[PDB]
C-alpha cells in the first residue's frame, strides 16, 4: 500500500522497434494528468504493447511488501505485489533532471531498458535508489 511510489494509467501513443526484434520504446501519455509523459523500453516478446492501449504503470519499492549476497527468488506461494501485474522490471533511478519550472523528469534503468518519467509533484515519493520495481498491467 505505502510501498507504491507512483501509479497511473497511461495511453500508449507510439510503439517503435528501432533495429530491435524484442524490445520496443513505447511512448505513453497519462490519463487525467496531462503533464505526465512516459517513455519506456519494454520486452514486447514477454509483454506485447500496441498503439493506443491502456497501461497501468506502478513504481514500487519493496515489491514483496543470510549475507549470501546473491539475489534469491521469492517462494512460489508468496503473497506479494506483481501478482496483479503482467510485466515487472527491477531497476534504478539514476538521474533526476528539471525540464522546466514545476516539471521534472526521472530516469530509470532496468538493466539497460530505459524509462523516462515526466511529471510535476512527486518529490516525496521518487528517490534515487536501487529499490525501484516497475509494474505494468494491461
Amino acid at each position: 500500500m505505502s510501498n507504491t511510489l507512483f501509479d497511473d494509467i497511461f495511453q500508449v501513443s507510439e510503439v517503435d522497434p528501432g533495429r530491435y526484434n524484442k524490445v520496443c520504446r513505447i511512448e505513453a501519455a497519462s490519463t487525467t494528468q496531462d503533464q505526465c509523459k512516459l517513455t519506456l523500453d519494454i520486452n514486447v516478446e514477454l509483454f506485447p504493447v500496441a498503439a493506443q492501449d491502456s497501461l497501468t504503470v506502478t513504481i514500487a519499492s519493496s515489491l514483496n511488501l543470510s549475507a549470501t549476497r546473491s539475489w534469491r527468488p521469492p517462494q512460489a506461494g508468496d503473497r506479494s505485489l506483481a501478482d496483479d501485474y503482467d510485466y515487472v522490471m527491477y531497476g534504478t533511478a539514476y538521474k533526476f533532471e528539471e525540464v522546466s519550472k514545476d516539471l521534472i523528469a526521472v530516469y530509470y534503468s532496468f538493466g539497460g531498458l530505459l524509462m523516462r518519467l515526466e511529471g510535476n509533484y512527486r518529490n516525496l515519493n521518487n528517490l534515487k535508489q536501487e529499490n525501484a520495481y516497475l509494474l505494468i498491467r494491461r
Partner: protein, 101 residues
C-alpha cells in the same frame, strides 16, 4: 581411492560451504554441460557453471553456489547422482525399445 580426480579449490571456496570451485581432471564439455544442467535443476543451487581454463590441459573447473540450505559439495554429489539416474532411465527406455521394435 583416486585423490587426484576431483579437487576442491580452496581459494575459490567460501566459509561454511555453499560456494566452491571443483577442479576435475580428464573431463571436458561432455560431463561439464550435463552436470551443469542437472545441478541447475536443483532448487537450492543459485549458481552453476563450468569452465575449461585452457584447451591444452585436461581440466575442468566447475563453480557451484547455493543458498544457505545445503553446501556446494552436497549439490555436486546430488547432481552426479541425478545424472546417474537420468542415464539409468535413458538406458532402460533404449533397451526396451531395441528389444520391442
Amino acid at each position: 581411492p583416486d585423490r587426484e580426480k576431483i579437487k576442491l579449490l580452496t581459494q575459490a571456496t567460501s566459509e561454511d560451504g555453499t560456494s566452491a570451485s571443483f577442479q576435475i581432471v580428464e573431463e571436458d564439455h561432455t560431463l561439464g554441460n550435463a552436470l551443469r544442467y542437472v545441478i541447475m535443476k536443483n532448487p537450492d543451487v543459485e549458481f552453476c557453471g563450468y569452465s575449461i581454463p585452457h584447451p591444452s590441459e585436461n581440466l575442468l573447473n566447475i563453480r557451484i553456489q547455493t543458498y544457505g540450505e545445503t553446501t556446494a559439495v552436497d549439490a555436486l554429489q546430488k547432481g552426479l547422482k541425478d545424472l546417474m539416474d537420468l542415464c539409468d532411465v535413458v538406458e532402460s527406455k533404449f533397451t526396451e525399445k531395441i528389444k520391442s521394435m
